[PDB]
Design a binder for this molecule. Structure first.
Ligand SMILES: [Zn+2]
Length: 193
């Protein structure tokens, strides 16, 4: 049972999403702060920002792992539907075509726990650039939330953990809905709530 409990930890690990102004905003993603929920199109690069208030130990990493939100689904591993996992589109030379969550980082490593089957992607933790508070990493989500035989309309979260040599040092999480029209789904979900 992977924990989703937010945890800044001793190093002050935090995530965020950059401001979107109407003039240059991407239509491929949008983040509802009131819902703590990312809306994003399938197979589009989505910017996620990370920081630590204090420098963590050398060689620390950041893991991204999707999990289902509701008790009725928590124990089931989140991964792509067989349809998308076995097609050739999106998958030419990918090392882990069944993983839902991908990261563009050059050193991204795709791992699967041999016992639980949990899939995640790990990248190095990095010092921000000069004068910058945040490091931006690019993720993609490789099925729609409605993929029959995959997510099948069940809600998911993505867990971000800062880790060093296996030990979780910090944790943040957001809900994620992968949909054709992030702005439309955000407005409608924010309206219903
Ligand atoms: Zn799919």
């Amino acid at each position: 049972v992977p924990s989703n409990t937010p945890y800044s930890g001793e190093y002050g690990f935090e995530i965020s999403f950059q401001h979107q102004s109407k003039e240059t905003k991407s239509t491929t993603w949008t983040f509802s702060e009131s819902l703590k929920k990312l809306f994003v199109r399938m197979a589009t690069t989505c910017p996620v920002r990370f920081k630590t208030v204090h420098q963590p130990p050398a060689g620390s990493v950041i893991r991204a792992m999707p999990i289902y939100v509701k008790p009725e689904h928590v124990q089931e591993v989140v991964k792509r539907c067989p349809n998308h996992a076995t097609t050739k589109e999106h998958n030419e030379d990918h090392p882990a075509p069944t993983h839902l969550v991908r990261c563009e980082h050059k050193l991204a490593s795709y791992v699967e726990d041999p016992y639980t089957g949990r899939q995640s992607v790990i990248i190095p933790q990095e010092h921000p650039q000069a004068g910058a508070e945040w490091v931006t990493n690019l993720y993609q989500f490789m099925c729609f939330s409605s993929c029959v035989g995959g997510l099948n309309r069940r809600p998911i979260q993505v867990i971000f953990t800062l880790e060093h040599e296996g030990v979780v040092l910090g944790r943040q999480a957001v809900e994620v809905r992968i949909c054709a029209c992030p702005g439309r789904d955000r407005r409608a979900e924010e309206t219903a709530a």
